[PDB]
Amino acid sequence: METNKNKFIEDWGSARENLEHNFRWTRRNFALIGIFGIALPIIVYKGIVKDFHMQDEDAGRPHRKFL
Amino acid sequence: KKMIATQEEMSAAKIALGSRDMCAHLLIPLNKCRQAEFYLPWKCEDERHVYEKCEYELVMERMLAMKKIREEEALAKQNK
Amino acid sequence: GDFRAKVWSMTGGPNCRPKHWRRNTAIAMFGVFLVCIPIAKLSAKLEQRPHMPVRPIPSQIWCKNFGTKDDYEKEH
């Protein structure tokens, strides 16, 4: 009942599993990791915090510090 | 022209808002006629033509009023 | 379907056409009728129809709620 499991598949499966051996901090990929690791979280954080600030501005209540 | 039979008599029939124009008085017998029949396009004709007469006369009144106002507006575009 | 005759195929195989399907069809109609009777009973039990009909409709033969919601102040 077990599948034949032809040889030309497990190699690619392990390459997808063992991709951790291919990483050398290339500059283009360094920028790619940096932007999606920091900038997008920062951009969205500004988005939510300013959404709260604008919501509170209309009601007239003072803005929370939001540390 | 003006109103003759409006307000509570108009309110009794479920007259569509916007369909309550100046000569909407005869629309109420018309709408009982539509409910009386099974909404036949050809059975009831005499009562529909008077309402189209209402609307048609209103439409000429509006177009002639605007043609008049355009007539004075034509004098406005005169730079000596 | 050489192998497809071995699967159960809950809704029917490739081309089933059982030996006696007409009797199954008839019992299916009977079951549908029997199961939709309580649906009809429930539907006739709960139906407001706030406005009275202009002409006698095939309703109010099993529905008793007619003009029961023109009292829109004692509403929970």
């Binding site: - | 369909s19 629309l27 018309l30 709408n31 909404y39 396009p41 309402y51 609307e55 439409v59 | -």
Partner: protein, 51 residues
């Protein structure tokens, strides 16, 4: 598969005529709560006559 074709043929030859008066009859009582027609954006009466 010919009877439904016949029914749709007999439909799309008289349904429009039998429904023109009874859905849009320049003030018909067919949309008491189904539709809300704004008095301002109500170009039905003036359309048929001023066009």
């Amino acid at each position: 598969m010919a009877i439904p074709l016949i029914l749709l043929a007999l439909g799309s030859l008289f349904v429009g005529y039998l429904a023109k008066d009874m859905m849009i009859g320049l003030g018909t009582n067919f949309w008491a709560n189904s539709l809300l027609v704004l008095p301002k954006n109500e170009i039905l009466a003036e359309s048929e006559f001023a066009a």
